[model samples]
Target chain A: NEFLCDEEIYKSFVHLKDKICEERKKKELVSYSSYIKEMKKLLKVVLLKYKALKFGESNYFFSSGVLNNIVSSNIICFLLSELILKNKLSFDYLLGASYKGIPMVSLTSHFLFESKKYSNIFYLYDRKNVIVGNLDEKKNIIIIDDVFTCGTALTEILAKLKTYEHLKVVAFIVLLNRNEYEINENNQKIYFKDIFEKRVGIPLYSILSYKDDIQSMIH
Target chain B: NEFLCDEEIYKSFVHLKDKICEERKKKELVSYSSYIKEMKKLLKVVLLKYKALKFGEFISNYFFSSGVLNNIVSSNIICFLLSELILKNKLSFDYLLGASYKGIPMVSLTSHFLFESKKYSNIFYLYDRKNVIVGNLDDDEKKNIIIIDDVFTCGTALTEILAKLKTYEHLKVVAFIVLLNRNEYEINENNQKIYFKDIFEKRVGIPLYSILSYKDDIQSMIH
Candidate 1:
């Protein structure tokens, strides 16, 4: 008299529905910015460790250890993903400069693709600044890196990328902005990002600012 | 009788059931080895592209582009995940050592996927021959580590890393993994040829696993 009567299957469906509802509630409670801020706090704790942070004779802060460690790198890649999604940035290619940016771009692209947000390929140039991949068509690209310090590194990368006339760089994104500034002739403070953006004509975005998020903790 | 009367929700549940059944059937039809073979074929094709592969005057093959391409890296990470799942080798480790320059991207992204898939949090360190160690090693706990690299040429880099790691009494290396095994050989004192794998395992007392081996997958492409 019963056409469909499998208790096991019925119970499984019930459990699936419950899980879906639970996940929906959780997502509703956590906003993207809040989630990103939480991750940044965790990364700050890890990066502040004695082994992770070091100071030179002049008290210049060195935190390259964050990129070398997987846990911290994973947190960074997560923050990048959240920021990209929150900002609705779209690109066809993610370019990373050699040594440090390679992993950042690689993992961020991987995570972004896996999340079904965007499908993008990554390109890397070696220490010699020779771009590694073949690009025949016009593409929207995003440059990714760990930290933005003096703007010199980004300039070198932009110079290398300039060779590819067909590639349009959408934005330059980094994990931390050192927030380096200089006084201009007008007696006004000019931040490096603004100067670089004016020169290269590409918007620069950073998930965390060193002056606002990290300098107080370091001091 | 009308407990599930919402048409939209009912349809969504039905679609989800269909997807689950479809995936189960697909997985049942394909074995792990067969999946790995298919992925290797795709990777081989990509590695053979003109821009991806380079040959020297002496007819030496260079495929460093495999490491530079994000698509290729995603493929490699997928293969690593599948292999780990199929082998179920219980490769629980606290640390991952990536040989600098070449090994950086490989270990970094692999650790990323591993953490995402299984929530296996691992601390990775970069080792450049010059610096010996580039990351924090402050923890005194007896730790299990896995060494990861791109190519197994002469095993010089691996040997150098192992030599430095030996000084750390608290660190124990469990395995060595590489993306490609060149499968080179050397002559022994007994007038016998000793393969790199045999010598490395015998000398270092650590098991070796290569995602692709020259003898098995690459030698045919040359001919």
Candidate 2:
């Protein structure tokens, strides 16, 4: 009984100590732009751009794309409410390869940077090819992306990332994760090998897993 | 205080009851073209327009007044930002107005919007008659106009526009189009699906040039 009590005490202390360490690492202490906040930024940009474009006076130029407003608005509101109510980031911004990742990735980065300059949310999309000022030795990061079909692009992005700047994959984010390729057979869901939560961390997060919802729209 | 607490507590109960009574709205709860989300819908169109316009696949047969507004807004901003960066000695655009004292701030707003949008500089001003809002269309052949000020207090100015517009052959006054919805004159049309709604998809090849992707600079940048 004494031994079990001692083990329990040690486990409790270790858990506490780890949290303190995590808190310590965040000493620069600024606001965090969780995925929900990021989505709000996306909605704002999308809304503003729509207004500016819709109300422009000069033509000589024109473009076409359709929008189903009610669906889009509800989708955004749902993403936000989820984060506000129940946090989830299992697939928030960790998108795969170039083609799929760009949309949500750039948007969320834009949201974070554009917000009242929150240091925790300052981010960048990894360009596979190195750009100048990137190789500057002192840089740390949190990876964000749009979708992960195979997770190969994400892995490559992660691999390329380590050399240019040392970063921990704090959490992988994606709007949707196909969960196709076996990342870890032991784990039912697989994309990034390590570093992610069953539901988002930062304790405040948002993610849309269309797996269940898509069926309603399909057919 | 006790009465207040009871009221507040009762209110909470009422709120709970309301929640139980009302069904939550669904995804298709509203129409596809809900104007509440106007901007997103417009952006999608702009994205597609940019692709086609870039490739020269289509010469713009459609011209929307909103397009002109976007360009005008964008140009004014560029002028100001350019002035700040010391691009030009004179904020030349302020004088680009139709009259005095009227052109300063809005001219600046147009430039600012343009600068933010990364668009070209083609700011314009509404020409007032003599000094009033009323004037005969000067027939100078510039289709683009800026309300510079959207509302003309007396009906005369815009009525002149509505009138003089007929004097010029083949002239299309594309905007009620400007943002002045409630003029003292009640010039804005009522009893319709709202101006933008009816005209958005049905403007013939002549769409309002309001999509960001397809603005003045995109159309006329080469020249």
Candidate 3:
């Protein structure tokens, strides 16, 4: 029953979870992007870009090709709301990383994060250059985004977050955790979670993970 | 206590009500657009271009704070009510076309509610500022589209969109829906109310729909 107030919304999440797993399975046969070569050269890591999920009655894909449907968007907000109510997760402010994260956090705010009662809301305006709205040290901050990839973007955001003293980042939340792992130069398997914990020192939480999705699909 | 779960949101709405009232009073003193002369000639109708509300922080930030744009629950209420209105009127469309920048969020919310009702629709957005299309448009076949936006100003934004849509041969914009209708009771020479809907349906050939009007919703909330 998921204990969610809305059952229809719960069913929508199940549908989106099914779609996400289907896309992951198809990722094996999906060809890599042309820029994979350049991406490897630049990041010292091989990257695979999955083809956009083709869905909707009219053959429409999201602008980002992921989590474009409003049902899917609502599901993410619902999960965050669950965390807030069940876990009593509190934050001083909700910060959307940038661009894509803006809407996700906005939806989350609409559902859970209350600007008037709980905390104020802000988003990074220019990816690297500027911050929008304002933040103060009086409250703890929670960083939100749609997906967790290489952990580099989160690091950049964390670095910029150094500008504010006493503003401790409590945790990081996302819709999907790629569960992508990489090898450090020392030949150690470095999970993205490890990188984030080592650098940012904050635990990461995602509504779904690739490993769990694969596991649930098998049985 | 306004039936909203949070008292803060209720207070915020009350705050926005006051800000809207304050803006209406200021609108009387503030002058019209500098290009009103040219705009009237082009549309063949005397139009009022409402300036998008500008407010100082912590006082009158309801435009984004509690208004239909950034706020989620308020938008849900708005989009849900709007969808009900559309369904009551039996308006059917294949796509929810959002006028970009401001309209994107509204389309997102509206699409969510529409999805719950099992209405088959896709979301597409157009950048009126850049005049660029973001989502896909179907092939050379007739498609019904309903354009959604936050407000109707001088109608320059939608006009530019129509100009761009001319490139698509079989795409038909069935209706335009907005959150609030500002131009109400401003009559024309024929005594017909001259809201933007009149201009769009009469001139541009697309019907306009709004769930609420500023005259009733905002005026009553504050007064």
Candidate 4:
């Protein structure tokens, strides 16, 4: 299950990435683009070293391989914050899918709080098929997760939230977009995000674009 | 299952608690004791309303009941930080135990906060699985390890983890930190009620700290 990078060196790299984030948070010395560039460079190496991304007859990606690392997960949270803020999105609550989404929601909420852009945002996750957290009726919420491949998890979460008539889902946010697509009734290819929005009426946003950001790095 | 408190009201209570924690972190106006006092009072209501703490036949306690609360979980992280600071011990650890499924999130957030606050650095996490350690440590060097978990039940999980760590002579088990201590008792061959904490502490010889003790906090209200 484990691969390339030496554990000691990998840890130091995490610390370095963390320091970069700290610098950005405290001093604004690191530009957003520069941060992303540096993060991607480091992330590419980490992902391959951890065997989180493997290219063979069929490519494979495991989010936990990256998220399990402290620095890598922190980078995801930072990027999620940037996505929300840059888009000028407003939300009162964040709903994380069970398991993987739990830590993302927790850390993202903390980073959002630190950003000082918004105040009093709440978070909850689905556990054992039950919604757990400070869930309120009539509040605007964004569902969060680590990866977006099949829309089944989000569909289930939406169905669960549907019972609460007062709640409104503003958007769905994820760390990485698998960029999966399917042929429609019209025989035209429709990306998952569009199909999801057409059906659920909620916009989907991903921090790392699989095609633009991830695919090239693998080569 | 669903419980007593109105979801709206519960959310407001959580917001209020978050503000209190913020006040403490930003400005020291809120004394630790006062903060704990206020937190306990609110926590009691949250626990009861959420049905996190029940006092019926056999009295079952679910850590997720309270843990599922966003403010409640954040409070746990803050209390963990305070526990280390108040003890006058400098934070030093190379790895945190993401004990099984639940501890995964707790350890992640704890390690992040600890590093962000500059209390600890270069800390990695190990998972609770067939003795698979994530980070490597030099064989001749002494490495500190902190075990992070959501609840303390029978100490079976901790014992199992300790057994795994026993294989690595260089690793020193520093402390076991959990969100809640059920404080449940177990009967031995002697048929005497022995608290899990006492037995585990005596047997394992590792310092155990809990952000909240069910018996200490909840029982006080009932009596």
Candidate 5:
């Protein structure tokens, strides 16, 4: 309820829900995040195996394929959803990066609430931030995303902000975490926490703690 | 996925799913028409209730209440989205009806898509109806007064083509965008499609919208 935005978020939630099932939102697919996860994987496999697809309406199947991206996307959104419902913050829009990052944020935010189990949140790609509206609605976002290693893109995103100055992104949530980071100015290898602590006011929360899980997936 | 063109019809699915849960990869929504029938009732409910509650994002949330649009408008749009095909009948600028007020999402979304997505350099409504290359300079400043007072009401709204003309600086009279277009209101009737506006380009286009088509509501009442 705290997150539903009931106004803005309603559009995407309703749109995505209808896309997956139809008028009949039943069919094991509605709330089944696991299934949503696997389906997105299937889409990735298909894209990789097949010839490249076109953009726009031509390759719109890719829109539906977002279910796969939701798995990773959801880890962060789920966290955000909980945070919003708890009144940690309020926002009208979340701008996600393009490519993998887009699918990550869009899918997670779409179903996390459309299933009506969590607070609704509207998610759109920052691929050109076309729509413009109240500046107040755009403040205090979580910089929601899937996973990142280098952090070059995240820096680029921060560059484009006109509002959201006090944009204290409470945290950065990722499905997985890795240690292959880089060195900052003092020649010190900038660790996730090192930079995250300085850049964002809040502590970063990497959902899976890949530091522990990656070992198992490898074997 | 046959129904996801909007939120309303999709809500129908949410209701139906609780009744049945499982995956049948080979199954399509079309195959289960009977089940879909049940879902429509819920879709109707979703739309009607959402509208009634007047949710904050009422505009985007229209799917929750735009029940009939599911069958008529959405199907046409889905046809475009899925098949990537359209009637393809030569898009003739023969007559452009620039609705004074918002006409439909199609015109706006399509126009924006053209400008941004398609990168179409020059897009116009009806300032220059290629069929009758002429000029429109009415002292009325509305641009359409001369044309509206003259002809172009077979269908569609008066000056709709005119306002669009003003946008493209191409003001000429064309078919008016209408509602019913009732067979009774043929050219013989008082152009009975309902006269909504006559903006001054000065005032505003008549904020007119109507359901040109529709889909069945959720079968909640067994009607």
Candidate 6:
């Protein structure tokens, strides 16, 4: 079926899986101290184009292949379905955190609720910092964003969403996480996932994790 | 199965067909004279809220619901309308032009219904509020571009797009599609009644089409 269990799509995802594993074994792919040098290199070679602006502590980047066009859009849609059906991430609202997430949440919302049995909506939090669109019926929200790094955007959005007392963010979904780690005062090693989950208070889910990619390839 | 077929979706599309035929049969909808009147009326009941701005002779407007247009019935209706236009007109498009921000999602949905993923590269957008064009389709050749937008008011945005696309002589604009055609106010310009639709076709030389006309929508609302 085009929607579910696409054989070619399975192979496509597996193709990336093999490439991810290959680079890590060769030591050509490695990350050091919040630096994702090799992964960025691999993305440019495989996914067409990838660019990011490094500003002090945060790196902001988006992929043209994955997020902008349909081929990668289909892949992310499949991953989202995995989270929804297999992982049981139930969400009445698929909230897109403005700009990049708009198409993502929009597509996901289309796949999940064309039947319209339940209410599904997407909201945009603009750069002007004003939030817009319908969220009156939203509860148990799942946020979809393209990239997750230092977590400022996610943190700020969670703060902005505090006014909507009825809405509770259940999870955060991203296509890529830079996989920068931190050691808390309690001495617990914290990945970007931990900062999103422990610090920001929403469980973070990403389609590809830098650490996982490295570990899968090496071991 | 979820992506391809569903009973509720089929029923929903059928429901609109019946409603459309009924509206046409009752003699409630016809012509463009009362277009603005009917659009205001239909929007009141169907979309519930929309806004228009007048800048001299040209008036601009947009439907807020379609921006929040995550509704299933809404998507299906728009999709059905788009498909019908293609089938009836026997229109073959090489590209889908969507203005950035609001127009993006709607275009994505319509392209999906049109089975546009295979030609997904054709989906290009004007970004930064008409500052730039994204999704490279300017590579080569003559192309029939299908531009989709939520609303077509003064044709300001469309004009900018036309101007930009003119650089590519090979890219020919087939039609401009929108969810609503307010058909509101027109102005006298150099002894001619200048409606936006007329201005677009005459000046830009591309036909403009809409799924729902303002007059038809308002007629349904009155009784």
Query: Which structure among the candidates has the greatest DockQ?
Result: 1
Per-residue alpha-carbon lDDT of model 3 for A122-196, expressed as tens digits?
A: 332224324443322356777777677778777888877787676677878876666778878999777878676
lDDT of 5 at B32: 40
**Judged by lDDT, which candidate is best?**
4
DockQ of each: 0.25, 0.01, 0.14, 0.21, 0.03, 0.18
The C-alpha stretches of model 4 lying farther than 4 A from their native spots are: A1-42, A183-189, B1-64, B76-94, B99-104, B117-121, B126-145, B156-175, B185-193, B202-207, B214-223
Residue pairs with backbone atoms closer than 3 Å in model 6 (clashes): B38-B214, B38-B218, B39-B214, B42-B217, B42-B218
Please give each candidate's TM-score.
0.69, 0.28, 0.57, 0.67, 0.35, 0.65
Candidate 6 achieves a global lDDT of 0.55
Q: Using alpha carbons, what is the TM-score of model 3?
A: 0.57
If you assessed candidate 2 against the hidden native complex, which CAPRI class would it receive? incorrect
For model 5 the local lDDT of residue A219 reads 32
How displaced is residue A190 in candidate 1, in Å?
2.8
Residue-level lDDT of model 5, residues A99-176, one tens digit each, is 334434433444344445432344433443332211222245555554555455666666665344544444555444
lDDT of 2 by residue, B78-153 (tens): 2222222221111222112222122222333333233332222222233333223322223433453322332222
Off by over 4 Å in 5: A1-94, A114-119, A128-139, A163-168, A181-189, A200-203, A208-210, A215-219, B1-13, B16-223
Candidate 5 vs candidate 6: which has greater lDDT?
6
Number of the candidate with higher DockQ, 3 or 4: 4
- Deviation (Å) of B6 in candidate 4: 18
What is the C-alpha lDDT profile of model 4 across A1-219, one tens digit per residue? 554344444465566556655665665644645665666666666666655667764366554533465666666776677678666788878877766676667677766765655434567766543666665447888888877886888988888888877778898898778888889899987788777789888899987677877778666
User: Which CAPRI quality tier does the interface of model 3 achieve?
Assistant: incorrect
DockQ (C-alpha) of model 1? 0.25
Between candidates 4 and 6, name the one with more favorable TM-score: 4
DockQ of 2: 0.01
